Amino acid sequence: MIHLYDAKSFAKLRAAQYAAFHTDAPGSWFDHTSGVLESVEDGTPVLAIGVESGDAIVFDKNAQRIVAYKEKSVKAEDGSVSVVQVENGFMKQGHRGWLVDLTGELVGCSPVVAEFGGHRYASGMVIVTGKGNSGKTPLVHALGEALGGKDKYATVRFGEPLSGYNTDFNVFVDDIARAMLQHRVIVIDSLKNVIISRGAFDLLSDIGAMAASRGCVVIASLNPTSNDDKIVELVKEASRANSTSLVISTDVDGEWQVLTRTGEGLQRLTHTLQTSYGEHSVLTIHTS
Amino acid sequence: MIHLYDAKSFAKLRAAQYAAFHTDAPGSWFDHTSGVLESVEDGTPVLAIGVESGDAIVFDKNAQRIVAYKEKSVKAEDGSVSVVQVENGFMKQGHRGWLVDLTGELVGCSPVVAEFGGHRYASGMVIVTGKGNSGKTPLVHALGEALGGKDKYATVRFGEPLSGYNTDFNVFVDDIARAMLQHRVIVIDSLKNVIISRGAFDLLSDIGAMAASRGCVVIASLNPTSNDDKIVELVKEASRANSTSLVISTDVDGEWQVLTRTGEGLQRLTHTLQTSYGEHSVLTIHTS
Amino acid sequence: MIHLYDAKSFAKLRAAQYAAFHTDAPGSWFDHTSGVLESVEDGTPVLAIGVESGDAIVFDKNAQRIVAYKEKSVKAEDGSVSVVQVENGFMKQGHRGWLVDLTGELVGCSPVVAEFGGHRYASGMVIVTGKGNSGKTPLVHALGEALGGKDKYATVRFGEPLSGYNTDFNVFVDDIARAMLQHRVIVIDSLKNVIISRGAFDLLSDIGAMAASRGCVVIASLNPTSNDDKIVELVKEASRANSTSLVISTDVDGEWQVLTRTGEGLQRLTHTLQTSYGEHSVLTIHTS
Amino acid sequence: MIHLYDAKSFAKLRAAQYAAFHTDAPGSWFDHTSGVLESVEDGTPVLAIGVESGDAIVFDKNAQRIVAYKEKSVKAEDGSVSVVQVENGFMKQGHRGWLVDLTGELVGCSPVVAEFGGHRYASGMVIVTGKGNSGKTPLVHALGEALGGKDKYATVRFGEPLSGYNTDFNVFVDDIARAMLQHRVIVIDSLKNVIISRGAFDLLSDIGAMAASRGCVVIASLNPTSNDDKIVELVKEASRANSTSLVISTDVDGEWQVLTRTGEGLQRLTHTLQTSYGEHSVLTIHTS
Amino acid sequence: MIHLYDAKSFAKLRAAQYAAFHTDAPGSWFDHTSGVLESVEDGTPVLAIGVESGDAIVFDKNAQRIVAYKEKSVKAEDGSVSVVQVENGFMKQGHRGWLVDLTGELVGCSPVVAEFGGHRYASGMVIVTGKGNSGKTPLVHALGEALGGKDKYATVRFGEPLSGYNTDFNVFVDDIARAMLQHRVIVIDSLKNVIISRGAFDLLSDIGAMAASRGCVVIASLNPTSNDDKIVELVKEASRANSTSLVISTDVDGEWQVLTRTGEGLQRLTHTLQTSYGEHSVLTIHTS
Amino acid sequence: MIHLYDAKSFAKLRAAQYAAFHTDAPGSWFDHTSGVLESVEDGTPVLAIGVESGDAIVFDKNAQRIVAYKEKSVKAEDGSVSVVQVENGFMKQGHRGWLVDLTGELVGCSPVVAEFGGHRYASGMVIVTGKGNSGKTPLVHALGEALGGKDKYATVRFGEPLSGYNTDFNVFVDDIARAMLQHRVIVIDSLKNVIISRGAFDLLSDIGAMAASRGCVVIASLNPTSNDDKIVELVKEASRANSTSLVISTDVDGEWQVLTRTGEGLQRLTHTLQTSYGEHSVLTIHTS
Ligand SMILES: Nc1ncnc2c1ncn2[C@@H]1O[C@H](COP(=O)(O)OP(=O)(O)O)[C@@H](O)[C@H]1O
Ligand SMILES: Nc1ncnc2c1ncn2[C@@H]1O[C@H](COP(=O)(O)OP(=O)(O)O)[C@@H](O)[C@H]1O
Ligand SMILES: Nc1ncnc2c1ncn2[C@@H]1O[C@H](COP(=O)(O)OP(=O)(O)O)[C@@H](O)[C@H]1O
Ligand SMILES: Nc1ncnc2c1ncn2[C@@H]1O[C@H](COP(=O)(O)OP(=O)(O)O)[C@@H](O)[C@H]1O
Ligand SMILES: Nc1ncnc2c1ncn2[C@@H]1O[C@H](COP(=O)(O)OP(=O)(O)O)[C@@H](O)[C@H]1O
């Protein structure tokens, strides 16, 4: 919705956004929105995501696709009316993104998803990219495990010439929808065949906000298919713009730089990761 | 409509346009158009705005969607006939923009929206842009609060990877329509995913004129998602031409330049803002 | 239609075209075509102009849209047949442009619209363009007044972020159609949003010939929205080719160069205008 | 159709093609095909030409449009079957170009159209182009008169901002069809709005062969809208490729170079024209 | 279909392919496929070729169009099923190319079409190209006659501004289909208007393989319509890759280089032609 | 589906993927998936592949197209549901790729297809490319034979101007589907006409993953149709990204570099091949 502010309510918002990253218990926002989703009436659409054509598919709170849903309207505090209809497996009335309100007045946050090695990490979309042919896949998995902490992370596989990899964009969006509905830490390998269809452009435009709203983290690899030239800089720019955090390779073997947007209008933080390989190319992120 | 002039009536027009910015009570045009809108007959379409596909959705004076409306025609002084018809929630006959006459003969104005720190600010569209990939969000909010003055400003959030941000263009235009119908000071964060769809092109083509007609100000952030190259100058040019006022970052920390189009054919004014951050990245614009 | 010539009739043609600019009473062609238009039978389509989609809307002599018109064919001297049919507000059969013969055998003219400051000015399209992003609006209005002479000039406003400006292309074509049907001197501010839709391309392609056929002058501003680079040269080139006269800014403050096509195959003339501002940015063109 | 050759029949063909340019009485081919056209059964389609959309309109021998024509097939010496159907004003079955056989075995000619100043000129398409803003219109008219000789030439006017100029492509193709059906010497002013729609591309691809097959000459002006740079060379190349003869401006005031394709695989000839202006910009081509 | 090999059966294939060019009687494959075509059952579709839109038209063994044909399926050795259905004159089921099996296991050949001047020439597509805007037409005809030997060659004329030249792509493909169905040596003048429509892209993609399968040679002229720049090398590359043999002009008057692909994976051979003109630009290729 | 991991199960995954390349019996994965495919119930869709339009055709285990198949859904461990429906020969519901589970939980492998000359080779897609326009065809055939070992390799021929070569993309996908369903070692000559249609893009995007899932190797030639310029680097880049292994030509006569992706996140290996020609251009890869 739209929100109205004066100096006082704006200062309160910024303090709450700051708290959502710096002082809330890690993963608290994810559990909060899990509760919101569990409260949703049975059969109710909760999430719509674009398929390759630019039509949207719609899911309920248990990550089941909805194929038929009679028109239903809802009136927000704003005065804005949301209408949702599903017919023949596709959204006929509605919008892409969350179809129920997960955030309320608390918008523009990068809710803390996990804390690891003395650093807090934001929910939202994390693009792992930069110069190089190689090394992003082990990093996304190492980050997945580390941010998962006590919990397993979910892996979405797409568009690589390896066994068992889905290459159909419409199964990809089904996987991502389910992942965000059910898991706090999600890895996508990779965004190669994403980066262009209407659905693919919808995904890059939508996924960060969807994830940040849920309080889950989506950790996605992106190789520059192009040279190690300076189309690299173009890829970093596009990635930075459409992600909540950016992780980029560096000059130095095994080192990565993490750039975090801590919230709307808030400080952007940077820190470095040092990593090393063990057996079978399993990567460890050093902390101590 | 079209308007006829000779030397004498043109001189009168330019005097009236000059006054609309320089001597009218700040915010007085907004109050006038609120009065015009309030006196419209119940159910009358007042505003049409393009959705992503290039079709238009239509609102009444209370910012509620008009879904069905039988063809009605109105005869202007110009002799021209305007027609409005809404069917299945979409405009079938009519034009984008204001469907009631807010201006009459008084056109080509940048009606003063507010006065702050010894400077008058124009209604219409204000694009906050320039080199850098940060700093615009705190500025748009500071400007929103400052120009709001005694009133709250409305915030429209779109297309950033942060919690609660809508990323559906059709919701965006609903938000902006409601905002202009109901508030004098409006902030958009951001124009990233705007600037391209038919609806998105319609928006940059229409919003400045819509806001100037109402006497409201729309303050919109725009990062060069492209480089800090030049690129930057292309964005400045495009922004300047399609906005009423332009606010651009400079090589001095915290300093911004404001470039105001004071009306049709009138002087373009410049002044500089100095700013600083307090707690939680809340920006203050220095004044006296 | 097509016209046949030998050396003798071609010499007569060129003499007649020459006279249409150099020796006819200024504005006499306009007065002639006004009479032709006034004598047109009631309900007759007289003008077809492209709307945004590339379809065409049709007007009668009073500038009212024709919604329904049963097929009517007309046989030319050429043996060629013209047909007009209008259905559901759109041209079903016919061509863009004037649908009645305004002039007779005399074609390829730049009929003199007015004389001012020792110089004759052509009807047709006049594009006011060149380097800089400022100064064109006051010039088009000063020209409008000066060429209007004893008569008021009509102002068409389109696609600028100021109060009262239409930003819908289909209202634009309506305005231009009414203007050319009813007035000898017309100002368009501006061509920004035209220069691309099929309707917009049609407009650039059609308006000069329409205006020259009527004997009215359309004076249109065009900024290079792009840089003050060699994009200026390209805009100038494209403008010159699709206009009857070109007015371009120069190196010298307040000075403009006017380049006039005096008719088919005839001499192109050049002269300069000197100008200055008075109060409220009202520009005067110097003469004596 | 296809044609089979051995060394002997090929030598005979080349000798006949050579004769068609060098030794036949000027304009003889035009009179021959006029006879062929006059022999055509009443109501029979003889010519199809592309309209702007890429559909084709169809004419009979008297240059009247055909709107309804029941399917009719014809078997050529080749074994190839030609089918022609017209429905609702458009070709439903058939091909663009001549729908009756004007040429027989005598194909690949540039039949002599006229002789002037000690030079033979070919039928087909003659593009008058080259560096410069100006000067092509007087040249096309001077050539028209000169090649017309005893006969008047036909003028097709299209797409210039001057009085009486058609700007609708579909009337343009109607004019050109009629001109080629009825006249040996045809001038088009200009190809500006041609050079892109399917119909426009069809015209450039078709018109030379259509004209050469008839034995008529189409003399068309083409300005480079672009600079006097070296997009000029690109325009010359495209023109040369799609015309039977090319006339290009030179370094020297009033001088033009004529480049003639004398037939299939035959010598290309060059000569120069010297010209001067009289009153009202009437151009004379010097001979003696 | 697909074919299985081991070392022994692959060696046999390469021997057979080598023989198809180097030791088979010249023109013997053509005679064989004529026999295959003659033994097809009456009414059987034998060839499908794409028309401009990308649909396909279908011919029988006598090069007559098949307009309606009930679905029929055939079981290959491969286990694969081919199906053919024609409805309203267009292929509804099937594939472009030969609809009967002309080759069996003997695939990847450049069957020798003729021997002339001590050199064997391959069937398939031969593109005659290179720098210059003249000389290709006389060469293609000289090569047609020379390779025709005891037989006449067939000439397909397309897309040049000369008398009797078809310029409709759909007639072009009918001409080429008939030519390949009925003659061993075929000349196309020219490929200008080919090289872009779906049908045109289909043609360059298909014709070489179609001709090589038949054992006929298609000799096609191609000018760089683009510059004599480099450009030229792009055309050479594109031509080489999509033809069986390439013939290119050189810096020596009258000299051409022939580059022959002798079969799948086999050596590419080169030899040079010397040529001279006689009367009426008839070119002779020097031999002994 | 999506898969969940913690540190322990991820370590097991990487160990299993490592084993799939380094220690599994060469060709064992293929033999496994053959058994899965053979045990599939009669009529079950097993493979969907995109045709030229971007629709998908569906095959059963015997490589026969499925024309009609009533909706059938299957529930995964993931909770996700897969559905297949085929109507009028096209997939109505489902995804591109394998429609049955060939492998189980083990994904992200490059299953060893064969061992030759002291080196293990991965299944999946192998693109043979690099500088030069010659030499790739003999290499793909030599690899096919060598990796075939005791078994024959299947050859898919597409889009070259030689006898018997299919040039219809839809037959191509049929051939590739049959090949992957029935053979462990597959050669495609070539990708020229693939590298763009939606089907062609689907193919590049899908085939590596399809082949790796099956445990078959597809060995595909690709010339840079463009120059031996830095376009080579771009082709190499695009090829590497969409292939499991890359084989590229070098500076040295007969020498090729093989670059193998051994599995998800695993080491990429490099080794060189030395080669020489025997009779009829049969290439041998040296070993001892
Ligand atoms: N033990 C190791 N030492 C060094 N590099 C390794 C090791 N294991 C894997 N790699 C590299 O890391 C990459 C693994 O990630 P991969 O998915 O192949 O590429 P990306 O991560 O860029 O998508 C491989 O390209 C490989 O070259
Ligand atoms: N206290 C602070 N001091 C200096 N810079 C800050 C501070 N807080 C935030 N910023 C900067 O201001 C930006 C906030 O606006 P943001 O939305 O991130 O970018 P933009 O405003 O350009 O869209 C951040 O990029 C951050 O780097
Ligand atoms: N009194 C003045 N002195 C100098 N410049 C002026 C004066 N009044 C207006 N201008 C300039 O002339 C322009 C008026 O025309 P405008 O419509 O703003 O641009 P354009 O004419 O290029 O469309 C303004 O940009 C302003 O900078
Ligand atoms: N008497 C003259 N002396 C010199 N130049 C002339 C004379 N008359 C006309 N011209 C030039 O010739 C041109 C006439 O042709 P025009 O149609 O205007 O351009 P184009 O022929 O290139 O289409 C004019 O541009 C004008 O500048
Ligand atoms: N007798 C001749 N001597 C030299 N050149 C000739 C002779 N006859 C024709 N030519 C050249 O050969 C060309 C004939 O082929 P043409 O169709 O015009 O071009 P292309 O063959 O490249 O399509 C002409 O351009 C002409 O310049």
Ligand SMILES: Nc1ncnc2c1ncn2[C@@H]1O[C@H](COP(=O)(O)OP(=O)(O)O)[C@@H](O)[C@H]1O
């Ligand atoms: N015996 C040989 N010696 C040297 N080069 C050869 C020999 N046989 C064939 N070649 C070259 O190898 C190529 C065979 O592969 P081909 O299919 O023609 O090209 P590509 O393999 O690049 O698709 C030919 O271009 C030819 O020039």
